[PDB]
Ligand binder design. Structure first.
Ligand SMILES: CC(C)(COP(=O)(O)OP(=O)(O)OC[C@H]1O[C@@H](n2cnc3c(N)ncnc32)[C@H](O)[C@@H]1OP(=O)(O)O)[C@@H](O)C(=O)NCCC(=O)NCCS
Ligand SMILES: CC(C)(COP(=O)(O)OP(=O)(O)OC[C@H]1O[C@@H](n2cnc3c(N)ncnc32)[C@H](O)[C@@H]1OP(=O)(O)O)[C@@H](O)C(=O)NCCC(=O)NCCS
Lengths: 293, 293
């Protein structure tokens, strides 16, 4: 545990009992916590309770931001318990619009990549937290992927954006993997997935189509797989695909069912945290739909 | 084709012959066309030729922006064909800094998602185009993905940022597809990809590995695939995976070769704009590595 000083601020190792007082200014704020992993803190005493817990986290370097005018805008640091550098930050609704979070985060990052001896850092930010993704982008964190999450106090799951910055980026990197499913009737498989997985055909070659691409998203680039028509008169040999989704399991499940897809659900909860059900294509392929809940 | 009216500007359906004169102020400007798809127009006549072509495009709904000062700062509108609604905009250098592009783009978008009857719009902006990424951010467009592109007049490829706004709200969507490769020797397959594709391990259930996950990226969430141990005279049907990569094809080619992987030979340029080579796994699975060049 060390100290960090920037061109304005001075980050100091968080002290639950000492900082719980100023920090509650953010943790007890609903508009600021309307973005955290749990609901806002009730009392500075509970905030204290929380704080001490976070520091406990193995390898959790957290600092209390101390602003240029004897004030404490908030917290910024690295989540411990991670097997790959996590970034955390939040300010009181007022310290907003000063570039504190950006400067404090950039500070923690800068430190982390060098003297901290990390090969890179990550920041998981919800899709709607524009103010946060803003901080992250300024700091040099770019989108590396995405994953669905679910906070217990939350009525439903949500989409997290995984942004990261490396000491030095890899010159080469695979942007995506598009797997091919040898299907008996492409034209039909497309109609199926378009309703069972809400996919859309990225493109269809042939009439009827003998090769196509199903975009599991409504956006140009993103998760998808291709469909290659096959002969026989044999069938094939099942391919297995795991689809990590966003949204409730049963919501998705209900989608699969309705579309008339052959399902091996309802959603069954699994010890690794997600709930799932398996769609089985006429040809035998098995698309496991996994969701946070 | 209708009219757009804003809290300052008035967007009017583009008129190649009428507006080509003013708009050439941008298309003829090299500093303004630096991020464009094509090089600047030599003459207001070429710009007119260019402009009519643009309008000809399928669903190309373009408007000439008219500023509250009897001036024409630039153009803004929706590109045609795209499939996934597209966004365009550019201003003459002298018209920069007045919030014109933001207002006019936010106009075209606001319109496009309602009375236009579109379910969403997308804007592909190069990573470097900070000034445009700024407008996009302001209009409410968020990063949905990224892809590598390559303009002819460009000496090389470049990163494209796909931002977007959905009038809709598809709650369910796939965040990733992780395919399973029935491999005879998991422990070793990991070694291979490890060096040939630069994969990283993450899973390793069983001793020795009977199921694993090869993260083709250093980042928590991202492209990857699973390895499932399979005995008997199988598999009989090899899996086909298409990996869209970043970097030059040969560069990647060398890696796979060096790694000692079995490649079908040097990178061949394909009609769809990528150069690729295939790695063939001992069990028959075919990994096609595709790069923009
Ligand atoms: C993230 C959060 C703290 C806000 O960050 P923020 O401090 O208000 O954003 P910054 O103040 O860091 O951004 C600086 C802004 O001020 C200006 N600014 C002034 N000085 C600046 C400087 N030195 N550097 C950068 N920007 C500066 C910029 O123009 C910038 O954009 P804006 O003016 O339009 O707001 C707040 O949304 C929050 O509490 N979120 C909950 C926590 C969370 O969800 N985290 C994500 C998961 S870890
Ligand atoms: C089209 C584009 C990017 C224009 O950028 P711009 O001129 O900065 O966009 P605006 O006109 O909305 O600029 C807004 C600026 O004016 C300011 N402004 C001044 N008066 C304003 C007013 N009354 N209302 C709103 N904003 C105002 C804003 O605060 C903002 O400050 P900033 O320059 O630091 O961002 C332009 O730079 C361009 O032609 N680029 C080349 C083509 C291209 O980038 N294409 C992208 C692929 S689609």
């Amino acid at each position: 545990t060390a100290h960090l000083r920037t061109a304005r601020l001075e980050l100091t190792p968080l002290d639950p009992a000492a900082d719980a007082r100023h920090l509650h200014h953010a943790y007890g704020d609903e508009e600021v916590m309307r973005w955290w992993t749990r609901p806002a803190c009730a009392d500075p005493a509970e905030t204290e309770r929380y704080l001490t817990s976070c520091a406990a986290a193995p390898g959790a370097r957290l600092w209390t931001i101390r602003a240029p005018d004897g004030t404490v805008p908030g917290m910024a640091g690295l989540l411990g318990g991670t097997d790959v550098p996590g970034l955390t930050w939040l300010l009181r609704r007022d310290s907003w619009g000063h570039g504190y979070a950006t400067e404090a985060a950039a500070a923690v990052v800068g430190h982390a990549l060098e003297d901290g001896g990390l090969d890179r850092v990550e920041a998981w930010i919800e899709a709607g937290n524009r103010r946060s993704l803003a901080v992250a982008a300024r700091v040099g964190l770019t989108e590396r992927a995405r994953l669905a999450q679910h906070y217990p106090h939350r009525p439903g799951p949500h989409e997290m954006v995984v942004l990261g910055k490396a000491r030095a980026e890899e010159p080469l990197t695979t942007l995506a993997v598009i797997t091919e499913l040898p299907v008996r009737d492409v034209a039909a498989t497309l109609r199926l997935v378009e309703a069972a997985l809400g996919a859309r055909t990225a493109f269809a070659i042939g009439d009827p189509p003998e090769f196509a691409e199903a975009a599991l998203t409504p956006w140009s680039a993103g998760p998808r797989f291709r469909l290659a028509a096959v002969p026989g008169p044999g069938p094939v040999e099942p391919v297995r695909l795991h689809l990590d989704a966003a949204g409730t399991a049963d919501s998705l499940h209900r989608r699969a069912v309705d579309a008339g897809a052959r399902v091996d659900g309802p959603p069954v909860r699994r010890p690794w945290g997600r709930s799932e059900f398996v769609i089985t294509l006429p040809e035998g392929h098995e698309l496991t739909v996994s969701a946070p809940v």
